[PDB]
Amino acid sequence: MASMERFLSVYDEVQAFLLDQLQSKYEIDPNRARYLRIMMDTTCLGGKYFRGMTVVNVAEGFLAVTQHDEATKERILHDACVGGWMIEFLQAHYLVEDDIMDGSVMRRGKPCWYRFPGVTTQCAINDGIILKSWTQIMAWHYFADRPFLKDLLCLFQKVDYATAVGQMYDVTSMCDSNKLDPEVAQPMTTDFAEFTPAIYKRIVKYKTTFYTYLLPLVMGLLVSEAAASVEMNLVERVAHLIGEYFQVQDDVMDCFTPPEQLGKVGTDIEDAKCSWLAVTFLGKANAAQVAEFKANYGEKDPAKVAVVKRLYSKANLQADFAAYEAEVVREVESLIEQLKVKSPTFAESVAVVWEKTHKR
Template sequence: MAALETFAATRSKLFAELQEDLKQRGNPSVNISRFLDCLTATTEGGKLNRGITVVKAGYALLPNPPTPQEHAHLRILGWLVELFQAAYLVWDDMMDGSEYRRGRPCWYKGEGVGLTAINDACMLKSCIFMLLRRHFRGHPEYAAFVELFHEAAFRTELGQLCDTTTAASGQIQDMTAERYEFIARNKTAFYSFYLPVALAMLYCGQASEEGLGQAKSVLLDIGVYFQIQDDFLDVFGDPAVTGKVGTDIQGSKCTWLVVQARELSDVHQQQALRESYGQKGMDHERRVKGIFSELGIDVLYTDFEKRRLGELQAQINALDESRGGVKKAVLNMVLDSIQQRDK
């Protein structure tokens, strides 16, 4: 809890810096006020797991106890990941037509926001590079930080493209395991799991080519597991706990659940899925959920989760930390943070 409070406290300092940058550019006060409202609304209420992962990974990688400057730098890098997350959630909510995020109306649903949220998300993303320049221009890995965020952006957008085009087609036969894997690795896993750890490795001077490669291999697999959890919670989770109402079924999303249902269903169930999956209305949603229940998708998920956790742990245990390999303790920390979550 203390680590979370310390991390959260850094946000006010960074927001004050961004406010000052806007003033220096001659922005009207109304612009500044509006943007600060956006910064606050889109970064509040989350678990902050991605940002805190940067900090915890950095502490584990530094050869000595962190100095005050290292403490501050790791927290700043963590908040840059949270800003990245905020920008893409704004875009994602708009594209999915979502109503709620973190227990409150999505940013674009706010009074007077609407489509201007597109530009708000662009500004959130631009703030990452403003703050990187301010705090890390003298760091030996500054260029690598910039390139990593650009790579994360491209991968996320590539995954989003595949996600939205698959949903738009509405064709159950297109929702294959291979397509699902591509979406999960790019849209979610890269920025949610590899980006935070790679930033910490770069900052701490622990980013050998072999170490980054090991980290990416494991963390992308962990990220796919995380996305499967998300898919399950969208349908079977409690909105009072998750903070959002599930939209995957009516949104015709390519999820782990529908991939399993497509492979396990008989001809009649497949016809029902084609008729109701992606259609608006609670009757269609209940029909799809009924098929999921008939197929025992919830039991299948429980068995999968137990098996997958064992596989991921074995993958970590098999790594060689010598010759610049990634520290197993960092990967174990990440895996432990998402095991059997309910939101």
């Protein structure tokens, strides 16, 4: 069976399971079950399923080199799929809540969940809670007797937490740290002293890399009972690097990809985000250019946005991006090499992960 069709089939299985359990154990009625089915579909489906399919890919790699009964191959693949959906539903929780936080309008060329007419923020915050709660519901159902259950739950737990810490780093990235204070409305930074590569790295590492790259990789290892074919510190380092690169591309697209292609109208500039463009700009601009940036960034006025975009366009950020990209290639290739010492197979799964990121 092709991997994607397996993975989509398991979605239907997991859906049915969750909704049947709501009827048998949680006294749900058919209309609320329908609302939840629609919510689940709308918020979990329609992306590329990169994250969830990485779990399946890493497990397939191990199957090709490990002796097992057919029923065991099927069970490992089923578990990789359930695990992959846990990550997809975790992502869905965070997109639902982040869209509400940020006042976002669209996602993937469709309205954000909370904007649907019969949803509203009042419901959608709770729908996002439910999303994450289903990850747990899946795990304990499907993995109840499995030897990797504790390590999977503890891993998932840590990644969830890291992610919520990363959101905190993201939404606060335009304020001066020394002024953070629940009692005082937060001004935007005027110095931009905190728009540094290391601060940017920290945001990205926590907000994106743990759930996008670390968790799918390590979940493939866990459902394959293969965590001893790797040096876990290498897996972390390679996840953090590739995840960085992913986010750099996302930041560039926010500013420069046409909205019809991007699936939304990018607002990083108006939102005063600590983006790769802003940090890279401030790391090379002259005094006059920095002063123009400060007078225009983080403002809704389209004239001011156009000025920041112009400043980026003239600062030859393509050169910095090339150089960055070239360095990420060296470093990711070096980690891949390292990973071969203990597992050629795992090393190749990582190379696929890198190719899919590096080309897209």
